Paper text:
Diabodies are among the smallest of these bispecific antibodies. They are constructed by connecting heavy-chain variable fragments (VH) and light-chain variable fragments (VL) with short “GGGGS” peptide linkers. Therefore, the two VH-linker-VL chains associate to form a dimer with two antigen binding sites, each consisting of the VH and VL fragments from the different chains. In order to investigate the structural flexibility of the Fv interfaces of diabodies, we have determined the crystal structures of 10 mono- and bi-specific diabodies with and without bound antigens.
Although changing Arg83 to a threonine substantially reduces ambiguity in predicting [name] structures, they remain significantly diverse, which limits their use in designing protein nano-assemblies. In order to examine the structural flexibility of the disulfide-bridged diabodies, we determined the structures of three of them. All were designed by the “Disulfide by Design” program using the crystal structure of the 6052 [name] as template. Some of them were crystallized in a buffer containing a high concentration of salt and organic solvent while others were generated in a buffer containing polyethyleneglycol. The disulfide bridges we introduced were located between the Fv domains and can essentially lock-in the relative conformation of the Fv domains in the [name].
Numbering used by the authors:
A (entry chain G), B (entry chain A): 2 to 118, 124 to 231
The structure:
């Protein structure tokens, strides 16, 4: 009882591929077949399952519609139809089966690798618990230096749209009170609120617009305590 | 100066949508548009760009090929062509503007919501630094109660396939030495290695197979000290 994976290799951002699992040593037609993948450096992640007869298919949320799982009973082979491939889909792809109706995967193929061809903004603290009158201070650390302070900060309240507060690190947009000020150079930038008002509690994103592909931080939530 | 987004709503797993941004208060010709999306509960993420006239377009890595960005000056609207939609694409999509040649987004639409059609296994510790002969203990925390007979442990060595060790919390696969043992119920499960041998240093994953969508733990790495 073995499983061998074929197809796969290197593909572009958006290409297409078909994976095959050649199944021997057992009665392919009645068992259930599955695909499990593992990105490099990461953990096992389940891809898809064909459950006995065709047309009874299930996919992970991430690979729905892009991936199609098929079985040819006569050839004892299992198929995976990968379309719209993204860099996040790169991984080693295994096929896996359990004997019987349901259970744990006890047979794993050798796996076949699929490979598909930016600055990072880190914001700290994740949460800021403050009170009015207090001095909020917010940090943004770029994984690389960012030229001539092409950096901005946005305030955003639940349901409302992002609102521009600071552009080019230290200059204030229209309608933003004096309390707001930005500073910092190179890789590290700081957003300072001299005194918090009731209206000031919101999420705050730093934004870099240096290359053609801008980036955002994950946000720092300034909330009451 | 205003921006109104339309289209969007509910789509199936693999469907498509076209987003419209109705632009007033400015001369559409003179400046360039961007789409920024924000999944619910997460931060801003930049999608795509038209830079003045058509054929000058740029996309994010995750949206390669699947999205086409379009604007027609004459009707004062901006278009976003979403295909092959995944659960990862559901979000509020904004259109955004900066005056002049380039800068930070100071004009933001209201956004329009797109929604596209789960036990979490947390493993501790991430790394276990031990020496042969010592006892190892590994934990697996399910985000919700999980029945016995639906939880498994896998051993995996670099360049090899996952190896099934425990099924049904306490039952050992064939050929698994006695030192290995599992335990735990409900939300908490434990893998114990009585005495560590050379062959035992590897990564170890917990696995739950209760629904049609199995899940894996992020892994616990057991390395020599």
């Amino acid at each position: 009882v073995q499983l061998v994976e074929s197809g796969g290799g290197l593909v572009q951002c958006g290409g297409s591929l078909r994976l095959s699992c050649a199944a021997s040593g057992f009665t392919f037609r009645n068992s259930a077949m599955h695909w499990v993948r593992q990105a490099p450096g990461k953990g096992l992640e389940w891809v898809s399952s064909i459950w006995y007869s065709g047309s009874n298919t299930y996919y992970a949320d991430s690979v729905c519609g892009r991936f199609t799982i098929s079985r040819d009973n006569s050839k004892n082979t299992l198929y995976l139809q990968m379309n719209s491939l993204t860099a996040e889909d790169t991984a080693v792809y295994y096929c896996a089966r359990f004997a019987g109706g349901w259970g744990a995967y006890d047979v794993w193929g050798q796996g076949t690798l699929v490979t598909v061809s930016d600055i990072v903004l880190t914001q700290s603290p994740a949460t800021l618990s403050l009170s009015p009158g207090e001095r909020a201070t917010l940090s943004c650390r770029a994984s690389q230096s960012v030229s001539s302070n092409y950096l901005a900060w946005y305030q955003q309240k639940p349901g409302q749209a992002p609102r521009l507060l600071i552009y080019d690190s230290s200059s204030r947009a229209t309608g933003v009170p004096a309390r707001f000020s930005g500073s910092g150079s190179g890789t590290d930038f700081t957003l300072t609120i001299s005194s918090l008002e009731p209206e000031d509690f919101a999420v705050y994103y730093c934004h870099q617009y240096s290359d053609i592909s801008p980036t955002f931080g994950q946000g720092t939530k300034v909330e009451i305590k």
